[PDB]
């Protein structure tokens, strides 16, 4: 097999897009906000210590624009795929599990009984599995052996290799262009659009 660096910590599609929001159950974030962050149209905050802002609050482009001068450079925010990575890595499993267990044991109610024990069970099953949450994203993308994908000779010298290698060459050229543009310190909007196109690919 092989591997592709992709020059960016892109996320996986089977997660956060199936029936259960697996990326949302760990971050306690709605699906709309998570989908809006990945397309560079949300610019969610990462972590703020002295700034008067929540940890996982929702933000907008104009909000960040007119609030950057207010709190200075203390507010750390990311609009790319690395935002979810950082929000998931800067989180302790047992520290949150203890708080969830304390909330479930102390506060017993009708609404408190549901939609809270499922999260604790999911956290326990994820901790006991030994898997790391930040591994839900694919920083490195492996490929399947080329023997399983022939050249598909239709008529004569037809080596188009369609329906299985077009996406591969597209992603490869997109990653190459993204790396080339990042090596020359390209503007922020252009590289954000390029990363969004690479994520879509």
């Amino acid at each position: 097999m092989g591997h592709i660096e992709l020059a960016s910590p892109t996320a996986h599609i089977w997660f956060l897009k199936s029936l259960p929001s697996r990326i949302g159950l760990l971050l306690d974030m709605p699906l709309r906000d998570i989908e809006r962050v990945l397309y560079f149209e949300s610019y969610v905050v990462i972590e703020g210590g002295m700034t008067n802002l929540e940890r996982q609050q929702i933000l907008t482009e104009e909000q960040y624009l007119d609030a950057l001068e207010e709190f200075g450079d203390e507010f750390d925010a990311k609009m790319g795929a690395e935002a979810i990575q950082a929000l998931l890595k800067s989180m302790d499993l047992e520290q949150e599990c203890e708080q969830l267990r304390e909330e479930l044991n102390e506060t017993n109610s009708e609404t408190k009984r549901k939609k809270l024990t499922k999260r604790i069970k999911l956290l326990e099953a994820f901790v006991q599995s030994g898997n790391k949450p930040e591994w839900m994203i694919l920083t490195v993308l492996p490929v399947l052996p080329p023997d399983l994908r022939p050249l598909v000779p239709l008529d004569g010298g037809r080596f188009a290799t369609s329906d299985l290698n077009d996406l591969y060459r597209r992603v490869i050229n997109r990653n190459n262009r993204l790396k080339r543009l990042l090596d020359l310190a390209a503007p922020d909007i252009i590289v954000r659009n390029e990363k969004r196109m690479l994520q879509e690919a």
Binding site: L148, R149, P150, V152, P153, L154, D163, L164
Partner: peptide
């Protein structure tokens, strides 16, 4: 009509 054209 899958990955392999026919494959032989």
């Amino acid at each position: 009509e899958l990955p392999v054209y026919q494959g032989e």
